[PDB]
Amino acid sequence: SLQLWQFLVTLLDDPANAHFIAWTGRGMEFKLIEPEEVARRWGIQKNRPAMNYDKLSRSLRYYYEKGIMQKVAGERYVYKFVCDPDALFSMAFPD
Amino acid sequence: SLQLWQFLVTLLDDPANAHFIAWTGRGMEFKLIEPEEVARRWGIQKNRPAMNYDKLSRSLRYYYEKGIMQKVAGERYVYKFVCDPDALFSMAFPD
DNA sequence: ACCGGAAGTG
DNA sequence: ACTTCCGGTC
DNA sequence: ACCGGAAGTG
DNA sequence: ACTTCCGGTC
Ligand SMILES: [Ca+2]
Ligand SMILES: [Ca+2]
Ligand SMILES: [Ca+2]
Ligand SMILES: [Ca+2]
C-alpha cells in the first residue's frame, strides 16, 4: 500500500490532477495548487475522514528528516523531492 | 513631544524599567521583555487607550524604512537601533 | 511572532 | 508620525 | 504558511 | 509511517 510520497507521485504523474497538484518543471519540484484537495484525496486513500493540509504538511515535514523532501523556501505550497544519494536510496528501497 | 523611538530610549536609560525593557549590551540592541507593558506605557504617553504590541511593533517596522531601527532576526522581541551614517543623521535631527 | 500594504487621523 | 486593521509566512 | 516537539495509533 | 494537536515565528 502507498506511502504519502508515493501517493503524491501517482497524483503528479496524471494530467487529470493538474488543477490541484502539479510538477513545476524544475527538477522534482511540485506545487499543491489546492492543498486541501490533495489532503482530501490522501484522507480517502488512508480512510482518514478529517485529513487536511495542516496535518498532511506535517508528514511532508517529517520527510525532511527522512531526507527525501525539502520545502522550496518562500514559494507557497511548493515542495521538492531531494535529488541526492540518500534520497534515491530511500525512495528506491522504501521500508 | 516624544517620538516612539525617543520614548523607548527614555525607558531603556532608566534601571526602574529593566524588568520590561532593557538594552542587551550588544551595540544598541534592546529587548521588549514585556512588550505589552511597553505598549501600555506608550499608549499612556500618546493618549492611545488601546495600544498593544501588535500596533506598537508596526511603528517599529516603519522605523526599518526610516533607517533608524532593524529587527534582530530570530530573537524574540529584540530590535536594535542602527549604527550607520543615515541612522545617526535621522536621530540627531528628527523632523 | 513577524512582515508590510492600505487607509486612516487635529 | 504614527494608528488601526489585517492577510500572509517558519 | 510554515516549523518542529510531543504523544498517539492494528 | 504517519496522525493529531498545537505553541511559536516573517
Ligand atoms: Ca512567497
Ligand atoms: Ca548518507
Ligand atoms: Ca528564536
Ligand atoms: Ca544615505
Author numbering:
A (entry chain A), B (entry chain A): 367 to 461
What does the paper say about this structure?
The Ets transcription factor family consists of 28 genes in humans containing the evolutionarily conserved 85 amino acid Ets DNA-binding domain, originally identified as a viral oncogene (E26 transformation-specific). The Ets domain is a variant helix-turn-helix (winged helix) structure, comprising three α-helices and a four-stranded antiparallel β-sheet. Here, we present the crystal structures of the Ets domains of the entire PEA3 subfamily (Etv1, Etv4, and Etv5) together with the structure of the Erg family member (Fev). Furthermore, a new Ets dimerization interface linked by a redox-sensitive disulfide bond is identified, and this dimerization is shown to result in a significant inhibition of DNA binding, potentially linking Ets transcription factors with cellular redox regulatory mechanisms.
We have also attempted to crystallize Etv5 using a similar construct strategy to that defined above (Etv5 construct encompassing amino acids 365–462), but despite obtaining protein of similar purity and yield as the other Etv constructs, we were unable to grow crystals of Etv5 in the absence of DNA. Etv4 and Etv5 DNA complexes were crystallized using oligonucleotide duplexes that had nine complementary base pairs (containing the same consensus sequence) with a single overhanging nucleotide on each end, which makes favorable interactions with neighboring DNA molecules. In all the DNA complex crystals, base pair stacking interactions between neighboring molecules allow the DNA to form a pseudo-contiguous helix that, in some cases, runs the entire length of the crystal. In the DNA complex structures of Etv5 and Fev (which are determined to 1.9 and 2.0 Å resolution, respectively), we observe a network of coordinated water molecules contributing to sequence recognition upstream to the GGA core. From analysis of the high resolution structures of the Etv5 and Fev DNA complexes (which are high enough resolution (< 2.0 Å) to reliably locate ordered waters), a number of additional contacts can be seen, which appear to enable direct readout of additional base pairs both upstream and downstream of the GGA core. The two C-G base pairs at positions −2 and −1 lie close to a highly coordinated network of four water molecules conserved in both structures and are coordinated by polar contacts to the side chains of Asp-387 (Fev Asp-99), Ser-390 (Fev Ser-102), Arg-394 (Fev Arg-106), Tyr-412 (Fev Tyr-124), and the phosphate oxygens of the two cytosine nucleotides at positions −2 and −1. In the Etv5 and Fev DNA complex structures, the corresponding residue (Etv5-Tyr-428 and Fev-Tyr-107, respectively) can be seen to occupy two conformations, one in which the two interactions detailed above are conserved, and an additional conformation where the side chain hydroxyl lies close to Etv5-Lys-432/Fev-Lys-111 and provides a large contact surface, with the potential for favorable van der Waals interactions to bases at positions +5 and +6 on the complementary strand.
